[PDB]
Amino acid sequence: ERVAAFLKNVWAKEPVLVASFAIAGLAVILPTLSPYTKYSLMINRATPYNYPVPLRDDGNMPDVPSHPQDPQGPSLEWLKRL
Amino acid sequence: MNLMLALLTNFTLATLLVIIAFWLPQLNVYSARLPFSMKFFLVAITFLLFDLEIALLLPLPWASQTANLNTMLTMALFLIILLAVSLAYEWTQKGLEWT
Amino acid sequence: MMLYIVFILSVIFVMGFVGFSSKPSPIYGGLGLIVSGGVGCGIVLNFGGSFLGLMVFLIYLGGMMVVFGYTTAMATEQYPEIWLSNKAVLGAFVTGLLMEFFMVYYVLKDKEVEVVFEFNGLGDWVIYDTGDSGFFSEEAMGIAALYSYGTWLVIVTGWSLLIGVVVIMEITRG
Amino acid sequence: PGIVELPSLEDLKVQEVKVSSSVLKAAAHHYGAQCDKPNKEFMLCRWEEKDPRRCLEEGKLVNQCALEFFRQIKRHCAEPFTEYWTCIDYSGLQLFRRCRKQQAQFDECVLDKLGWVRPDLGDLSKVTKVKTDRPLPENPYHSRARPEPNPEVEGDLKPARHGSRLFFWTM
Amino acid sequence: PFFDVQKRLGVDLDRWMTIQSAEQPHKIPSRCHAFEKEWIECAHGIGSIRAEKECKIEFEDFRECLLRQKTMKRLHAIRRQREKLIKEGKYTPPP
Amino acid sequence: MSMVYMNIMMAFTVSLVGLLMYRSHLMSSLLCLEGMMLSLFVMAALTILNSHFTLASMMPIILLVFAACEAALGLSLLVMVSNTYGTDYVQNLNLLQ
Amino acid sequence: ATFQFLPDEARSLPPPKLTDPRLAFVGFLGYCSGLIDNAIRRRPVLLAGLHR
Amino acid sequence: MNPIIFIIILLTIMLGTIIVMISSHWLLVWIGFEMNMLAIIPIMMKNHNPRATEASTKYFLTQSTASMLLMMAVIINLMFSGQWTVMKLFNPMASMLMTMALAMKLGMAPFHFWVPEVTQGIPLSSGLILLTWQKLAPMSVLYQIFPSINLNLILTLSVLSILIGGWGGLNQTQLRKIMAYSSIAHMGWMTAVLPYNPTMTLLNLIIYIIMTSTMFTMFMANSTTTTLSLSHTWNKTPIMTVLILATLLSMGGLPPLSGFMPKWMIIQEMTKNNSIILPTFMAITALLNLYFYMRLTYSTTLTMFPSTNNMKMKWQFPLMKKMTFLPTMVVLSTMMLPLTPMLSVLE
Amino acid sequence: SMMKWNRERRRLQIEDFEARIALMPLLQAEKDRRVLQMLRENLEEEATVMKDVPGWKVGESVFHTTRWVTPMMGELYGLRASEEVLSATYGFIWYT
Numbered sequence A: 001e002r003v004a005a006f007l008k009n010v011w012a013k014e015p016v017l018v019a020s021f022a023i024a025g026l027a028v029i030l031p032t033l034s035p036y037t038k039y040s041l042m043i044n045r046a047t048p049y050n051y052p053v054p055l056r057d058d059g060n061m062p063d064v065p066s067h068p069q070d071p072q073g074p075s076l077e078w079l080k081r082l
Numbered sequence B: 001m002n003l004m005l006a007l008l009t010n011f012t013l014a015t016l017l018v019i020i021a022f023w024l025p026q027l028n029v030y031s032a033r034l035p036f037s038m039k040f041f042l043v044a045i046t047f048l049l050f051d052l053e054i055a056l057l058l059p060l061p062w063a064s065q066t067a068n069l070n071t072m073l074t075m076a077l078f079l080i081i082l083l084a085v086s087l088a089y090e091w092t093q094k095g096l097e098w099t
Numbered sequence C: 001m002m003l004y005i006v007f008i009l010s011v012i013f014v015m016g017f018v019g020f021s022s023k024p025s026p027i028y029g030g031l032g033l034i035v036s037g038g039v040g041c042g043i044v045l046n047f048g049g050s051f052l053g054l055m056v057f058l059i060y061l062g063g064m065m066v067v068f069g070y071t072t073a074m075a076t077e078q079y080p081e082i083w084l085s086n087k088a089v090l091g092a093f094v095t096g097l098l099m100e101f102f103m104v105y106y107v108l109k110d111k112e113v114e115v116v117f118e119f120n121g122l123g124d125w126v127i128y129d130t131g132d133s134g135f136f137s138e139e140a141m142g143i144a145a146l147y148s149y150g151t152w153l154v155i156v157t158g159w160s161l162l163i164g165v166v167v168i169m170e171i172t173r174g
Numbered sequence D: 001p002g003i004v005e006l007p008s009l010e011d012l013k014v015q016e017v018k019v020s021s022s023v024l025k026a027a028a029h030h031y032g033a034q035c036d037k038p039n040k041e042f043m044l045c046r047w048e049e050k051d052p053r054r055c056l057e058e059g060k061l062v063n064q065c066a067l068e069f070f071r072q073i074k075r076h077c078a079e080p081f082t083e084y085w086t087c088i089d090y091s092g093l094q095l096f097r098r099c100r101k102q103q104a105q106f107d108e109c110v111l112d113k114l115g116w117v118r119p120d121l122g123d124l125s126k127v128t129k130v131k132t133d134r135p136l137p138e139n140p141y142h143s144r145a146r147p148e149p150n151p152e153v154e155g156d157l158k159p160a161r162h163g164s165r166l167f168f169w170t171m
Numbered sequence E: 001p002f003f004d005v006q007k008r009l010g011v012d013l014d015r016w017m018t019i020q021s022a023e024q025p026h027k028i029p030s031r032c033h034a035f036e037k038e039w040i041e042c043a044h045g046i047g048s049i050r051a052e053k054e055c056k057i058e059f060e061d062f063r064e065c066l067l068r069q070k071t072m073k074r075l076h077a078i079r080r081q082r083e084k085l086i087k088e089g090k091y092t093p094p095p
Numbered sequence F: 001m002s003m004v005y006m007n008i009m010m011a012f013t014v015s016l017v018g019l020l021m022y023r024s025h026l027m028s029s030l031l032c033l034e035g036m037m038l039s040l041f042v043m044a045a046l047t048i049l050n051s052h053f054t055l056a057s058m059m060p061i062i063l064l065v066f067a068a069c070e071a072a073l074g075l076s077l078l079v080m081v082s083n084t085y086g087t088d089y090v091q092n093l094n095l096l097q
Numbered sequence G: 001a002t003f004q005f006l007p008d009e010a011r012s013l014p015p016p017k018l019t020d021p022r023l024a025f026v027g028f029l030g031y032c033s034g035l036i037d038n039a040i041r042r043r044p045v046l047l048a049g050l051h052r
Numbered sequence H: 001m002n003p004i005i006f007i008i009i010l011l012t013i014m015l016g017t018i019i020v021m022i023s024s025h026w027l028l029v030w031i032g033f034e035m036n037m038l039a040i041i042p043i044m045m046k047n048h049n050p051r052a053t054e055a056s057t058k059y060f061l062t063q064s065t066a067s068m069l070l071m072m073a074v075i076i077n078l079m080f081s082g083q084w085t086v087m088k089l090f091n092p093m094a095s096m097l098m099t100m101a102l103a104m105k106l107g108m109a110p111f112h113f114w115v116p117e118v119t120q121g122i123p124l125s126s127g128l129i130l131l132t133w134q135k136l137a138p139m140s141v142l143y144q145i146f147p148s149i150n151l152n153l154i155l156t157l158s159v160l161s162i163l164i165g166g167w168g169g170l171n172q173t174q175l176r177k178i179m180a181y182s183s184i185a186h187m188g189w190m191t192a193v194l195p196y197n198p199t200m201t202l203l204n205l206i207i208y209i210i211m212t213s214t215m216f217t218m219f220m221a222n223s224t225t226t227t228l229s230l231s232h233t234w235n236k237t238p239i240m241t242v243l244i245l246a247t248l249l250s251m252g253g254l255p256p257l258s259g260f261m262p263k264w265m266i267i268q269e270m271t272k273n274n275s276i277i278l279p280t281f282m283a284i285t286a287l288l289n290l291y292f293y294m295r296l297t298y299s300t301t302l303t304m305f306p307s308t309n310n311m312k313m314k315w316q317f318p319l320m321k322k323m324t325f326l327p328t329m330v331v332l333s334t335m336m337l338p339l340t341p342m343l344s345v346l347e
Numbered sequence I: 001s002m003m004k005w006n007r008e009r010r011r012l013q014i015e016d017f018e019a020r021i022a023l024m025p026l027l028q029a030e031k032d033r034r035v036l037q038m039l040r041e042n043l044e045e046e047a048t049v050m051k052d053v054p055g056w057k058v059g060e061s062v063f064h065t066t067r068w069v070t071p072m073m074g075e076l077y078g079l080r081a082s083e084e085v086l087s088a089t090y091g092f093i094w095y096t
């Protein structure tokens, strides 16, 4: 109640500063609450700037595809449907 | 070369226009301290220091591509807040006044 | 030749330094530094430093040197003394140019000079990197890394700039 | 220091792929799917040997597979392909998104005539594994022997004999 | 450092920029990565007194990559001999 | 070394000599101080760029930022000196002999 | 170790005795500091502030 | 100054020093010096008078010039080694510049001219920071780059500082100038032993800081800045004259006082290295310092100078300055010789 | 609307980058031969210009190590026409 009548005063007298503090407050808080923030790291990771150097096949790499179109390896199906 | 040619043409043409402006047939036969406020000096210094912080912020469009987004965002917001803090300090210390 | 553009720029760079280091009126000394700053950007641009070069214009020339000129107009000079009207400035100015010219004349002729230390004269192009075909600016990648690797650099730099505001207000209060 | 060995001028001759960048750009996605095996064998060699002189034979097999790849487009899909890379070639940035209509015609032609399937988003950036009979390099950096470490100190820490022994002090 | 707080706390304040063979954005290598890498590994853990003599070969190679003073001196020598011979008409550059 | 290093090293020396050979205006010495920084920035950028030492690319910016903040402090002291004696001449700063 | 006042290996050594003559001297120096504290502030040197 | 701002500025001074002492990267070392200088100027200016403005200006120019030379050495080192690690330098020209840059920061002769003037022009509390805390950062760098330092250069700087500091102090009546020349002489001893045993540099540094802090604190307690002002202390605070007497004799290196220990340990290290002429010359030259310490003891403690009538009013009021840590510092300034072997904690 | 469009633009960038990755083996193979041809050509010129200079070995390395070392510009174009060197050196920086 004491804070409520404080906000009314600043809103009437310093609306520009109230907007500034509110906008800046949202910028610091919303990334922790947004459910899309995790896709920002995934998309950045998925972008291949440098060449993907192939590994030497030792016969003990069941999770490493032998060909780009093979079913092993990271997928971007989640990104297409994003 | 193209850019240097562009710059040369722009300032060479500027030089030519300025000299022909100064020349034409006229058809005629016959170190101290300014009385200037310290406030204006403080505007220049304040601009300079903020201009230095804007230099630190310019890389942000590239920095947003990093995979270390958690660190990137925290430091980006940290720099802007401190810039806001210095503005708040000047404001409360009567540094943005003219009376 | 165009292959020597960097060397040519570095020669002008030195003359600009002799210009303001002989210390004419700080109005002209500031002008000599502005020209050196612009040439300094040109040198940095030709080594692939696009972003770094433009920071010289934006920050060094458009920021610091504007304030230098601004302060000169208030607290140092309003009218300038005739350039080279002082014997000491002219003597220093002539002394520097001749030293610079003798350095340039010999290096060009021999493709190498020994001014105290050994310097080559084949051209700056010879030390350049030969193979490059990444799809990005490496110079831009490094500067962007300030926000992911240089957490410590940001904190201390950010703190120092805030302190600069506090300190300058204390200094000027009286 | 010695003499830098270099392969002979005729040890470097090969049939070059003399097509423009917009042709390669237009064919890149099918090219990456079709010529992966020699391509990855060559790139494995380069990152392992760190010496271009050591992968010249595998580099030649890269050209042969690419020339064979393009001879196979020229033999079945010449006209749909020319339309496509000519649309790519028009753009100053050689954008894919401006040519989806011509891309589909080329994609359908290779699929019908050569069973070629365009790799999906993300495929060509995968890290794959390669089988090579080339032995794994032993000393790729050609590094000398490392200096021996200093004699490590091991033992029981006893009190200093008679203390500091500084001038007259007894402790 | 005078006080090695970084090692003792296990926090990296500035070691990441100290050398050019450390991790870089997008694995971009420096031009002298292999030379610095070799010299660092030779000189690791033996002290600068020993390293100045026992890793001299690596440091000499590394310094050559950094400043290329020998390489330029050799090219300057071949350039001298050509534009001399060209005057005595004893050499004809290829097409 | 390369040609450019000759002239860049020379520019630093010229501005250093200029700084150590004062005239009258304090501003003239602050300019020589900022000329030294300019040549340092150019010398470091050239070295860092040529060697492709990527993470060091931010170093010249940090140098520029701190130096400019350092130049701001110098200008503040110049105006305070100028507010006391009416000029920025360094021969007025001799009370502490 | 690095930047450690007393590394772990130092625990093999016998501890200084609480009756160490050097430790008594250090205690004496502390007592002297207490007296000089009283003197500079013009308190009764011996009796003032026994807690201090 | 607002008390909160003063604390923040003091912490920035400390943080700038700490950054220098914990950095493994030359850029961060340079940043530490820049930060430290930025925050030290306001405390020199805090009384707003022309002498304070002159001192801050002379300080700014000297430190700024030195920091430029430090950066030049760092870049030359980068050119010839391709790395930024804080340690020995890899070019002799870089070593000379860095050594001269740090000598300029420390105020060693013949880059000493600023120390007496800046100290005289700033308050006693600012002079205390200038002549004690500000030595930590340059000395901590010298501690790490000493293997690459030119021996002739560093010993020449040391000998000149002991000579200049000793001779300069003889002509002084101002207490802040006396302390300034005392500082120059003591930096000379610290750097003379650096090539041989850096631990003795730290020992001399710490002991010097303790005694210098003691003297500045006792000068502040009575608001004395001149020899004659200090000669009134006997008729106000007799105890303080005894403490001043003991501390000055300690700073003179007289046994059995704490200030003998650093001179004694330094002589030992150089003799172990077959250096006999240099320690002997330094010890004899240090008698110049002992002379103008003794002069102060004569006017302060061992004789009673004339007083003034208005002094009787001061008898009625207590000493209300904080005098923080003075009882501890004065005891350590004088009575530590029996604990000399404890110098190994610095090893 | 900006989120939808920027997400699509990221997918388009990945497709463009993957096209580059598919071609890099072919471009890398071509580059190796070009560098080695240019070094072999410079060697033949050296063997003739310095054919009997007192004590001049031909093709001697300046490095103690035998590891392959990437040549710099001067070692590749050191004896070639100026316009090729301008284009090879400053061409990219000047294209703008």
Ligand SMILES: CCCCCCCCCCCCCCCCCC(=O)OC[C@H](COP(=O)(O)OCCN)OC(=O)CCCCCCCCCCCCCCCCC
Pocket: G039, H237, H238, H239, H240, H241, H242, H243, H245, H246, H249, H256, H257, H301, H302, H330, H331, H334, H335, H336, H337, H338
């Ligand atoms: C143990 C190992 C270490 C060995 C090294 C030696 C350590 C000793 C040095 C300790 C540090 C100095 C502290 C000395 C304490 C002095 C306190 C004292 O004795 O009384 C001072 C006296 C009292 O004055 P006040 O209290 O203000 O009023 C008196 C009214 N009753 O004030 C007066 O009345 C003024 C009297 C006139 C001045 C006389 C000066 C000559 C006496 C000086 C003695 C101290 C000399 C210290 C040098 C070391 C001695 C060996």
Ligand SMILES: CCCCCCCCCCCCO[C@@H]1O[C@H](CO)[C@@H](O[C@H]2O[C@H](CO)[C@@H](O)[C@H](O)[C@H]2O)[C@H](O)[C@H]1O
Pocket: A021, A022, A024, A025, A028, B081, B084, B085, B088, B091, B092
């Ligand atoms: C929500 C988090 C988002 C991040 C925001 C970034 C941090 C920025 C920090 C700025 C701090 C400014 O803090 C501000 O200080 C002044 C002090 O005068 C206060 O204002 C007070 O002082 C002024 C004097 O000018 C009075 O007129 C006013 O009546 C009084 O309330 C404000 O109540 C407060 O808003």
Ligand SMILES: CCCCCCCCCCCCO[C@@H]1O[C@H](CO)[C@@H](O[C@H]2O[C@H](CO)[C@@H](O)[C@H](O)[C@H]2O)[C@H](O)[C@H]1O
Pocket: A028, A029, A031, A032, A037, A038, A041, B069, B070, B073, B074, B077, B078, B081, B082
């Ligand atoms: C005066 C100093 C002022 C300093 C102010 C600093 C403000 C910092 C505010 C936000 C900092 C972190 O901002 C955001 O927080 C959330 C908290 O989980 C992080 O976490 C979020 O993204 C990650 C990325 O995968 C997800 O795995 C996670 O599920 C999600 O919660 C974000 O990755 C980070 O971008």
Ligand SMILES: CCCCCCCCCCCCO[C@@H]1O[C@H](CO)[C@@H](O[C@H]2O[C@H](CO)[C@@H](O)[C@H](O)[C@H]2O)[C@H](O)[C@H]1O
Pocket: B068, B071, C148, C149, C150, C151, C152, C155, C156, C159, E010, E011, E012, E013, E016
């Ligand atoms: C005046 C204010 C003073 C306040 C001082 C507060 C101290 C702040 C400490 C900052 C450094 C924290 O510790 C450091 O943080 C960064 C980012 O999180 C980490 O760095 C991380 O980002 C990049 C990504 O590769 C790399 O540097 C490194 O691979 C990674 O670990 C370091 O691994 C960690 O050691």
Ligand SMILES: CCCCCCCCCCCCO[C@@H]1O[C@H](CO)[C@@H](O[C@H]2O[C@H](CO)[C@@H](O)[C@H](O)[C@H]2O)[C@H](O)[C@H]1O
Pocket: C117, C118, F009, F013, F016, H076, H091, H092, H093
């Ligand atoms: C206050 C004045 C400031 C002016 C600053 C002017 C810039 C100074 C540039 C110094 C950079 C060149 O520094 C110098 O380079 C050459 C080139 O290998 C080095 O090499 C030279 O000395 C050593 C001596 O054994 C050997 O390398 C070699 O015999 C010799 O050529 C020098 O040891 C080095 O000191």
